[PDB]
């Protein structure tokens, strides 16, 4: 019940997670001691408005209110845009950008780490990420989605840390969260065998406590129960005839967009 993406359909995807990769792109610089999250939310939109001439997916999605979600340290995920939360010397931050672009959604996210690092943060950053990259190099056509859920949460654990249940990684092309699910861990629940064309996500959430999430009273903000920092990354990306690429992969990530299996 999985859309496979036509050359055309993929090429669309292609422009659509590229931009939706220099949203992230263009914010870092603005990513500084002093800033709030309202004004980096006026600033992602401005752009994917004005000079990508895209939409943001996330604004009025499900009653969603900004464009862009910004999640701050404790914050896991959904954390919304505010004038008056200033980032600081420290903290961890998630931007998670979802555009529309011709029909079709590129969707992403990356930690940066504001001013002075702290260094517990850098490592569950760094395992983040690393706990992606391993996921991404797994998709091939015949490898099952499950292998790639049970593959993530061995990683992170062994760290000392956990992944979070309750939100998962998604289909995605014309419709903003299609199936299939791609959970981040292993559940007997889940059954899927990849083949070339289908396009997902995968956005392991990692709290360097333990697994429980919370909703806050704006019915928006997660966060963790034992209030510990988590960290987000995402990737989209296209199943192809020997393994994937990457559609919204960023200068600064140290995976190539095509991963080849072949010899
Ligand atoms: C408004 C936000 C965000 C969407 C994305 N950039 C993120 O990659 C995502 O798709 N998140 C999903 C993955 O499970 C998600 O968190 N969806 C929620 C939907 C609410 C809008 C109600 C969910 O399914 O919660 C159980
Ligand atoms: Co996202
Ligand atoms: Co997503
Ligand atoms: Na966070």
Known sequence: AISIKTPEDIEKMRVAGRLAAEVLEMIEPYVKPGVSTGELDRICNDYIVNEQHAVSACLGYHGYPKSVCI?????????????????????????????????????????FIVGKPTIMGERLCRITQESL???????????????????????????????????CGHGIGRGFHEEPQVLHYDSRETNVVLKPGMTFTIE????????????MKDGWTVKTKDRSLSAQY??????????????????????????????
Do not use: W
């Open 71 to 111: 999640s701050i340290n404790e914050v896991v995920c959904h954390g919304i845009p505010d004038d008056a939360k200033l980032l600081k010397d420290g903290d961890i931050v998630n931007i998670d950008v979802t555009v529309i672009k011709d029909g079709f959604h590129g969707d992403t996210s990356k930690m």
């Open 204 to 215: 392991p959430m990692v709290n360097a406590g333990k697994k429980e999430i919370r909703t």
């Open 133 to 167: 990259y391993l996921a991404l190099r797994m998709v091939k056509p015949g490898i099952n989605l499950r292998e790639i859920g049970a593959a993530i949460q061995k990683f992170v654990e062994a760290e000392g840390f956990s992944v979070v249940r309750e939100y």
């Open 234 to 263: 995402e990737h989209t990306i296209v199943v192809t005839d020997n393994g994937c690429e990457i559609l919204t992969l960023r200068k600064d990530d140290t995976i190539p967009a095509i991963i080849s299996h072949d010899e």
